[PDB]
Paper text:
In the case of the glutaredoxin that is the focus of this study, glutaredoxin A from the cyanobacterium [name] [name] 6803 serves as the preferred electron donor for the 2-electron reduction of arsenate to arsenite, catalyzed by arsenate reductase. As part of the thioredoxin superfamily, glutaredoxin A shares the characteristic thioredoxin fold. The structure of the wild-type protein is comprised of the major protein secondary structure elements: four α-helical segments, and four mixed parallel: anti-parallel β-strands that form a single β-pleated sheet.
Due to the location of Ala75, one might have predicted that changes in structure and function observed for the [name] and the A79S variants would be subtle. These replacements are located at the extreme C-terminus of the protein in α-helix 4, and both are exposed to the outside surface of the helix. Neither is involved in crystal packing interactions nor core packing interactions, and therefore, these positions are predicted to be highly tolerant of modification. Interestingly, the [name] mutation does not coordinate sulfate ions in its crystal structure. In the wild-type structure, sulfate #2 is 10.6 Å from the Cα atom of Ile75, while sulfate #1 is 35.2 Å distant. The large distance between the site of the mutation and the ligand binding site discounts any direct effect on sulfate binding. As there is no sulfate anion bound to the N-terminus, the His-tag of [name] is considerably more disordered that the other glutaredoxin structures that do coordinate sulfate. The same residues in the [name] structure without a coordinated sulfate anion show an average temperature factor of 32.6 Å2. While the elevated temperature factors can be explained by the lack of sulfate coordination, the rationale for the lack of this anion in this mutation is still unknown.
Numbering used by the authors: -10 to 88
The structure:
């Protein structure tokens, strides 16, 4: 297959799984989104506007928390908008996304 291929035993190529639960018009959710979008990372947004079930699903994963947003990286619970910004401020976010 013609091209410049990288070898290092990746086998099956997968990248970090990045997830965010949101309300579309939540100013905190929007701030969190801006941040990831700024990084250029690939992520999945679970926009649960008016969805009671999904909030419950969320809470199950988010340590009982129903506040928004809720962020996850490689199935690790990161937390809310606050949390991710603190991580970025400390130089800790990029190693997770990761680089």
């Amino acid at each position: 297959m013609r091209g410049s291929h990288h070898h290092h035993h990746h086998g099956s190529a997968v990248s970090a799984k990045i997830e965010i639960y949101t309300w579309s018009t939540c100013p905190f959710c929007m701030r969190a989104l801006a941040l990831l979008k700024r990084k250029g990372v690939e992520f999945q947004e679970y926009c649960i506007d008016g969805d009671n079930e999904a909030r419950e699903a969320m809470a199950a994963r988010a340590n009982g928390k129903r506040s928004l947003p809720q962020i996850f990286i490689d199935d690790q619970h990161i937390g809310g908008c606050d949390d991710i910004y603190i991580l970025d401020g400390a130089g800790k976010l990029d190693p997770l996304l990761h680089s």
